[PDB]
Design a protein around this ligand. Structure first.
Ligand code: NA
Ligand code: NA
Length: 415
């Protein structure tokens, strides 16, 4: 019988956006005990990247702090005061890989971690979002209503502040119940190793894929044509510069459809450019929601970038010498099956061995060990010459994963 928690017990907090209010909250954090419940909000889909537009904390006695990073930077707040106030306290985060890069970028230094998402997965929780996890362990429902908000909106509305507060409101109580359960399932040291690793990986700049410009939707329709790819490259790059400069989501400045369209058509002049309508008109987000007015706020920034700016870029791309145009295991089992059936036979023996361990320990198979590490291991015509335990370790698997898995995997490979 879950109960809806509509507001925090202490009420909806005011935003901390002045230097005195920051120094006050830091003092209260210094005066408090136990773990630090943490979270962050970002204006994804609206602003450029993954800059935090809100930062949320709770500590027993200090209560909930909703901290405005941009206002506090302008007020000249020192985030090192925060670190000194908190010390080596445990940070509780749900999916810590999301918020640790942003915390690191503000200059915060979490020294210990409890990841409630990581813990839920190890425990075998099949739906592991915050709301599903707190209902499972605390019998309390959070109505997650303002998840896709533009967190750059000032002043922050009371409902949004309430959402942001509710996201740190139950994390210390979550940790307590989930530690007790991990210990009883005998997974507490597995948990700890996964926290250690997440803090190592997350606290630092976030992962960007190998070649960013290649991630334009429908790019495959243009991959045979290297001059089109030079156009896609050039357009993506300039769009990325201007999106960062003007602090706006890149696809609000120029759609992927427009990029692919002009890469196909290759307009050589101004009249040829004007015939392509999409690149001459402002991007319009239509979702038939209250969100439409929220995107429409960015129209004056969108209008600041003119069609002519893309026209110049297409010219540059088309003036490139042809010799300057651009061109571990496959994740797709189809590729394995079609091209390397003998390697796949070995992999399938490995996969069923890892699945068996998943069952016997009641841990999701992808959590037991990262599926890609097993694929990389079997991506060879000499699988019996693998030092399984060492290879898996060098891949980035944790000691507990190697100790649980490697011998049985070695046996499966041998047959
Ligand atoms: Na988050
Ligand atoms: Na959140």
């Amino acid at each position: 019988e879950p109960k809806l928690l509509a507001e925090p017990r202490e009420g909806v907090p005011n935003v901390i956006d002045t230097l005195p209010a920051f120094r006050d909250y830091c003092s209260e954090l210094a005066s408090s005990h136990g773990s630090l419940a943490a979270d962050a909000e970002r204006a994804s889909g609206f602003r450029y990247g993954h800059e935090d537009w809100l930062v949320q904390f709770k500590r027993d006695g200090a209560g909930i702090g909703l901290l405005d990073p941009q206002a506090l930077a302008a007020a000249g707040a020192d985030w090192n005061d925060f670190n000194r106030a908190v010390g080596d306290a445990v940070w509780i985060l749900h999916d810590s890989l999301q918020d640790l890069p942003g915390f690191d970028e503000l200059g915060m230094e979490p020294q210990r971690l409890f990841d409630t998402e990581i813990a839920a997965r190890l425990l075998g929780l099949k739906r592991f979002g915050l709301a599903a996890v707190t209902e499972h362990f605390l019998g309390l429902t959070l109505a997650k209503e303002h998840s896709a908000a533009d967190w750059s909106y000032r002043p922050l509305p009371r409902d949004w502040r309430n959402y942001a507060a509710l996201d740190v409101e139950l994390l210390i109580e979550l940790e307590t119940k989930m530690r007790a359960e991990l210990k009883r399932q005998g997974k507490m040291e597995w948990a700890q190793e996964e926290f250690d690793y997440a803090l190592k990986e997350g606290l630092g700049p976030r992962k960007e894929h190998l070649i960013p410009w290649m991630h334009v939707s429908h790019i495959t329709e243009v991959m045979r044509d290297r001059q089109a790819l030079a156009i896609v490259r050039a357009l993506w790059t300039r769009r990325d510069e201007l999106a960062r400069e003007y602090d706006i989501a890149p696809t609000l400045l120029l759609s992927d459809s427009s990029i692919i369209e002009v890469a196909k058509r290759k307009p050589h002049n101004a009249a040829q450019f004007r015939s392509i309508r999409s690149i001459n008109e402002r991007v319009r987000i239509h979702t038939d929601s209250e969100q439409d007015k929220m995107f429409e706020r960015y129209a004056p920034i969108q209008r600041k970038i003119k069609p002519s700016m893309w026209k110049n870029i297409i010219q540059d791309a088309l003036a490139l010498p042809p010799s300057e145009w651009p061109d571990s295991a496959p994740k797709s089992i189809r590729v394995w099956k079609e091209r390397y059936p003998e390697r796949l036979q070995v992999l399938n023996r490995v996969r069923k061995a890892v699945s068996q361990i998943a069952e016997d320990t009641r841990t999701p198979v992808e959590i037991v060990i990262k599926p890609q590490y097993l694929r990389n291991l079997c991506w060879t015509d000499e699988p019996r010459k693998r030092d399984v335990a060492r290879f898996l370790s060098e891949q980035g698997a944790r000691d507990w994963q190697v100790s649980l898995v490697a011998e049985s995997v070695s046996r499966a490979i041998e047959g």
